[PDB]
């Protein structure tokens, strides 16, 4: 089948879940490697909201 909602969850959160409901009759081949070495961030889409009030970037200046 497939699920091409890039917003409602990351591609691991869909491919783990579409094989828990059993609609996919075969897993993708990259699936076990994410199940072995996941990245440090969950790659879900977030809208870029923009800084408005007294909320600057928390970076520092190098001196």
């Amino acid at each position: 089948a497939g699920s091409r909602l890039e917003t409602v969850g990351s591609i691991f959160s869909r491919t783990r879940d579409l094989v828990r409901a059993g609609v996919l009759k075969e897993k993708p081949l990259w699936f076990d490697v994410y199940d072995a070495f996941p990245p440090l961030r969950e790659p879900v889409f977030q809208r870029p909201r923009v800084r408005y009030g007294k909320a600057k970037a928390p970076i520092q200046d190098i001196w």
């Binding site: 089948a1 497939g2 699920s3 091409r4 909602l5 409602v8 879940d17 059993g22 609609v23």
Partner: protein
Amino acid sequence: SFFTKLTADELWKGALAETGLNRGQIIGEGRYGFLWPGLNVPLMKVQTIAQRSKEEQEKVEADMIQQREEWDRKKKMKVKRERGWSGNSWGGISLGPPDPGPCGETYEDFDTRILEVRNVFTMTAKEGRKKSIRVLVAVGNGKGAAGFSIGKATDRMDAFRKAKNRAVHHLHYIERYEDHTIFHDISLRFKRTHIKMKKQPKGYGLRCHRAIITICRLIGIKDMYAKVSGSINMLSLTQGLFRGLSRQETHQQLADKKGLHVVEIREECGPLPIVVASPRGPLRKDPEPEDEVPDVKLDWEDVKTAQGMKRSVWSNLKRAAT
């Protein structure tokens, strides 16, 4: 004359007026009683050119009358069409299971139900009113996974298959506390439409809006109270239904976001504190700060029901069984 007679295709073209019969007549029958050894007989064996009688012909000509009439009564049959939400309205009309792909990839568990049809128009340059039909389906097989998408084309039959073959590619996995319900009482708004959707115990029946009955029967959620307020526009209802059914915290997540064991108390049971989920890993030795009467901005329509002051003659109705 003879040459004024013409073919059959130029007859139905002139009589049907779609620009703004020959199944029983075998080649061997004739009105005058007649047989030929080529056809209408035992083939090549009666082998003499001979004719019939008159009242035998009155037996087979009356047969043709009953064949056409019975075939016409077969044309005049009322199809036992399933009633979806009303007669003469493509409401909860079930289509078949959606179409298989170009290599394999069957979808035999899925079901498709229509949600809203709309004869939509747009004034174009040449033709004027361009009527297109804008249909909306939902896929789902029970089993926690479902989806929905829209179709838009210039014909009824061709717009349905557009929406079916789209929605099997756009799927959510609606998680469930064990099958029949959801996790927490969720209340959201999709652009105008405040939907309050609360968790219910078993046997309650789907006391929820006419669309949401025929969506959760495709997800497997068997009973849930869902009062939709504000605007009820069918596509904006469903895209609000589907996010808050997906933006959903399982009991193993409620632990693992906070640590601590999640306990549940059932009123029909005793005080038996059944753990539904312990965290996968550590355990926190800090009990929760039990600040009573917290600032959870609760609704108003739950307080008037929990007080029981107000009433409606359609508040609690003995309706049918889903």
